[PDB]
Scaffold this active site. Structure first.
Site, short mmCIF file in Angstrom:
data_model
loop_
_atom_site.label_atom_id
_atom_site.label_comp_id
_atom_site.label_asym_id
_atom_site.label_seq_id
_atom_site.Cartn_x
_atom_site.Cartn_y
_atom_site.Cartn_z
N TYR D 26 0.86 -1.18 -0.04
CA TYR D 26 -0.04 -0.06 -0.10
C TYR D 26 1.05 1.30 0.00
O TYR D 26 2.21 1.38 0.14
CB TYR D 26 -0.75 0.11 1.37
CG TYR D 26 -0.32 0.40 2.62
CD1 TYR D 26 0.78 -0.15 2.97
CD2 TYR D 26 -0.44 1.69 3.04
CE1 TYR D 26 1.56 0.30 4.05
CE2 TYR D 26 0.26 2.12 4.14
CZ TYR D 26 1.25 1.39 4.64
OH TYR D 26 1.90 1.89 5.88
N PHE D 36 2.06 11.04 3.64
CA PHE D 36 2.29 10.58 4.94
C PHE D 36 2.87 9.28 5.18
O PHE D 36 3.45 8.86 6.27
CB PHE D 36 1.17 10.54 5.78
CG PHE D 36 0.22 9.48 5.77
CD1 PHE D 36 -0.72 9.46 4.78
CD2 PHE D 36 0.03 8.78 6.86
CE1 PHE D 36 -1.92 8.57 4.69
CE2 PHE D 36 -1.25 7.70 6.71
CZ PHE D 36 -1.99 7.70 5.56
N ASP D 37 2.72 8.16 4.34
CA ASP D 37 3.20 6.86 4.53
C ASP D 37 3.37 6.12 3.06
O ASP D 37 3.01 6.59 1.90
CB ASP D 37 1.87 6.16 5.20
CG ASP D 37 2.46 4.88 5.74
OD1 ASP D 37 3.74 4.51 5.58
OD2 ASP D 37 1.70 4.19 6.43
N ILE D 56 -7.66 -0.37 10.61
CA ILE D 56 -8.66 0.62 10.53
C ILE D 56 -9.74 0.14 9.76
O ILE D 56 -9.81 -0.72 8.83
CB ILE D 56 -8.49 2.26 10.18
CG1 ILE D 56 -7.63 2.20 9.07
CG2 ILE D 56 -7.78 2.77 11.57
CD1 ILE D 56 -7.04 3.75 8.57
N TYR D 82 -9.97 7.35 12.52
CA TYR D 82 -9.14 8.38 13.28
C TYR D 82 -10.00 9.56 13.41
O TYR D 82 -9.83 10.80 12.94
CB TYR D 82 -8.00 8.77 12.57
CG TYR D 82 -6.96 7.82 12.24
CD1 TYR D 82 -6.00 7.60 13.66
CD2 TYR D 82 -6.87 6.69 11.34
CE1 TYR D 82 -5.25 6.61 13.42
CE2 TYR D 82 -5.96 5.79 11.34
CZ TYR D 82 -5.14 5.83 12.30
OH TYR D 82 -3.86 4.56 12.62
N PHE D 99 -5.87 6.34 -0.21
CA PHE D 99 -4.97 5.49 -0.15
C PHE D 99 -5.00 4.77 -1.71
O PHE D 99 -5.51 5.02 -2.45
CB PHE D 99 -5.70 4.22 0.47
CG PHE D 99 -5.39 4.38 1.83
CD1 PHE D 99 -6.04 5.09 2.63
CD2 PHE D 99 -4.30 3.62 2.91
CE1 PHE D 99 -6.02 5.29 4.11
CE2 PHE D 99 -4.35 3.82 4.05
CZ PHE D 99 -5.10 4.55 4.68
#
Lengths: 123, 420, 48, 107
Positions: D26, D36-37, D56, D82, D99
């Site tokens: 991912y 962020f990732d 999540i 979140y 995503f």
């Protein structure tokens, strides 16, 4: 300084407007901080002023300056047109339209790298 | 509030030498087409996604640089207001993705063929992928400059160009009104693949650094264009009879004879006897071509005067041998210009006239509803010399030049001088 | 708006292989080796 | 608020069932676009078991809605992940997440 009669303000005055190599060409002033439009759209009294989302700034063209040669408005960061022959026709503007497979349109978006008016269109 | 760091990929941009633009005086078409077949794409060689877009771009505005720039980086086609990109499922323009509705929409997978429909009359760019059109088009963009096809790629991408039948082979039929893209090549330069606005060029002895490229302007494709004194009024038919007699000597030298019909394959010339033997439409043509090249001779600033009519009349005709006489037996006798030597000021002025005469001719041809292509399509209004004179190749440039060098020294042999 | 500014050349560039193959396949172009760099952002101006 | 827009189609028939592991390569962003990732930078195919609520709620609901080898773009709403407070230090309060996943193998 900002007074009771005047807001906080900043000016631009020409140093050498007399003789001895008075340089003059169309310069472009941008401020340093952006404003940000919200992520999703909506689609004085202390009540209205603490809920409002609409803002105001102001410029004042002094005497001795023609509004025919003054352009005021808004500019996004991807704008790099540095020319001395700029008129409002020389503004990038691209219209994006999308539709269905039937051909009937669904949306007509126009992106421009510049959002201004002409001061000569009022005086 | 702070600075952010990231690893990103490099992008470049490539193009052919196909710069199509429109204007008032338009020798160009304004509605084109080309295809791109993708056959080898790794989706993820790097940490970032493999960048690959295809579209159209301006000349003076789109300047991709190999690092930095607008946005997060790796900016290419569609990443500002100067180009319009498509990746398979997004319309890239002004540095924003635009989600499209395509049937079987995906990225540029291998064994896919994309196409770009372009219109300059209405501001319009469309796309079809694998024969299937997309549901979205661009409008209302500016028209101050030329346009060329662009594909911006990251690493790990192998792709081929489909330009036209002489170079590619169109895997789909163009929609009617869309010329194959190998037609807008200029006569001075062959078709070639190049980067854009570069500075590094890897050489033999080290790498080379280049300066800025000199771009062809927007209006480098539009061509360009009084009273007559009585001392030149009488000599106008004199050079006209000189021109037809020089033409019939040029006709008889290759094999044209005097025939009642005009057959070039049979080598027949109905103007091979004399200028008076030329027909009245050709006799009127020889005079109106005489008055045109003289009214423009004073228009550029060349002063002309009349002197030495006796030595002009004392100059006889050029000698015509038995090989010079054609099958009709009547060899024309044009005025001898072996005594007159053209000056370098005249060698400068002989080019400025043939530049004007060719461009004012194509000005009539552009008013006749004609546009340029590399191929010669007469019913489709294509003539391969439909450019301004400096864009013309040297062969036709010399051809009108040796044509107009005949009228100079005979008029200098008629005694008339030329100021510069 | 100042007209020009000093930037920095990178130390390596994309190796591009352009070659016309066939009079009907056309002009081919490819690249295989990846080359990456680090980048700051200056988020107030979106100019990396 | 689980919107799956496809990027490349997979097998179309193989779906993850419950009590099973997945391997997802991912990466994520925010709506501003700030990355962020990722996973490929760590060079590790991220794995997890479905159903057991390790990830999540917007993730595993997107996960079983994919085929094997498919590449999908997800959009998890604020209320699904979140929600009020967000992650400490990373994800701000009331943030919509974006995503890019890919089911590598194992259903």
């Amino acid at each position: 300084d900002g007074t009771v009669d005047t807001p906080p303000c900043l000016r631009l005055a020409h140093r050498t407007w007399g003789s001895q190599n008075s340089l003059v060409e169309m310069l472009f002033l941008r401020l340093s901080l952006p404003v940000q439009f919200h992520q999703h759209f909506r689609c004085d009294d202390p009540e209205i002023i603490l809920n409002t989302t609409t803002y105001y700034y102001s410029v004042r063209v002094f005497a001795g300056q023609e509004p025919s040669c003054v352009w005021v408005g808004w500019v996004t960061p991807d704008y790099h047109q540095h020319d001395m022959n700029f008129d409002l026709s020389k503004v990038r503007a691209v219209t994006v339209t999308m539709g269905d497979e039937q051909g009937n349109v669904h949306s007509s978006l126009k992106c421009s790298n510049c959002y201004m008016v002409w001061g000569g269109d009022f005086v | 509030l702070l600075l952010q760091t990231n690893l990103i990929n490099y992008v470049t941009s490539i193009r052919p030498n196909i710069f199509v633009g429109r204007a008032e005086g338009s020798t160009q078409y304004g509605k084109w087409y080309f295809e791109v077949m993708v056959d080898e794409v790794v989706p993820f060689l790097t940490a970032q996604a493999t960048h690959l877009r295809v579209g159209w771009a301006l000349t003076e505005g789109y300047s991709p640089y190999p690092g930095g720039g607008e946005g997060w980086g790796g900016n290419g086609v569609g990443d500002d207001l100067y180009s319009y990109g498509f990746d398979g499922l997004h319309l890239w323009t002004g540095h924003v993705a635009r989600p499209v509705t395509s049937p079987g929409q995906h990225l540029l997978a291998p064994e896919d063929v994309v196409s770009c429909c372009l219109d300059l009359s209405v501001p319009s760019i469309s796309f079809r992928i694998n024969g299937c059109p997309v549901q979205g088009v661009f409008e209302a963009f500016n028209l101050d400059g030329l346009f060329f096809p662009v594909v911006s790629f990251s690493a790990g991408v192998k792709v081929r160009f489909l330009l036209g039948g002489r170079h590619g082979e169109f895997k789909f039929l163009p929609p009617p009104g869309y010329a194959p893209c190998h037609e807008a090549v200029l006569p001075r330069e062959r078709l070639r693949l190049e980067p854009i606005k570069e500075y590094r060029r890897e050489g033999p002895r080290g790498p080379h650094l280049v300066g800025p490229s000199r771009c062809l302007s927007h209006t480098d494709f539009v061509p360009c264009p009084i009273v007559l004194p009585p001392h030149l009024e009488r000599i106008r038919e004199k050079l006209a009879e000189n021109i037809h007699e020089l033409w019939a000597l040029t006709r008889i030298e290759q094999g044209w004879t005097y025939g009642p019909v005009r057959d070039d394959n049979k080598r027949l010339h109905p103007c091979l006897v004399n200028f008076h033997s030329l027909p009245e439409p050709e006799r009127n043509y020889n005079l109106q071509m005489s008055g045109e090249t003289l009214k423009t001779l004073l228009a550029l600033g060349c002063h002309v005067g009349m002197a030495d009519e006796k030595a002009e009349d004392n100059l006889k005709k050029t000698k015509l041998p038995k090989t010079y006489m054609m099958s009709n037996g009547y060899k024309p006798a044009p005025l001898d210009l072996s005594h007159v030597r053209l000056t370098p000021a005249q060698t400068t002025l002989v080019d400025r006239l043939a530049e004007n005469g060719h461009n004012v001719w194509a000005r009539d041809r552009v008013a006749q509803g004609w546009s340029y292509s590399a191929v010669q399509d007469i019913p489709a209004r294509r003539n391969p010399r439909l450019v301004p004179y400096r864009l013309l190749d040297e062969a036709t440039k010399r051809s009108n030049r040796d044509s107009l060098c005949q009228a100079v020294r005979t008029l200098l042999g008629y005694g008339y001088n030329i100021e510069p | 708006l100042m007209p020009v500014s000093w930037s920095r050349m990178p130390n390596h560039f994309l190796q591009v292989e352009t070659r016309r193959a066939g009079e009907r396949l056309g002009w081919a172009v490819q690249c295989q080796d990846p080359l990456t760099m680090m980048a700051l952002h200056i988020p107030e101006e979106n100019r990396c | 608020g689980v919107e799956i827009e496809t990027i490349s189609p997979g097998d179309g028939r193989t779906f993850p069932k419950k009590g099973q592991t997945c391997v997802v390569h991912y990466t994520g962003m925010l709506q501003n676009g700030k990355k962020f990732d990722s996973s490929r930078d760590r060079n590790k195919p991220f794995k997890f078991r479905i159903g057991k609520q390790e990830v999540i709620k917007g993730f595993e609901e997107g996960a079983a809605q994919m085929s094997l080898g498919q590449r999908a773009k997800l959009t998890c709403t604020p209320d699904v992940a979140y929600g009020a407070t967000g992650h400490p230090g990373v994800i701000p309060p009331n943030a919509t997440l974006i995503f890019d996943v890919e089911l590598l193998n194992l259903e």
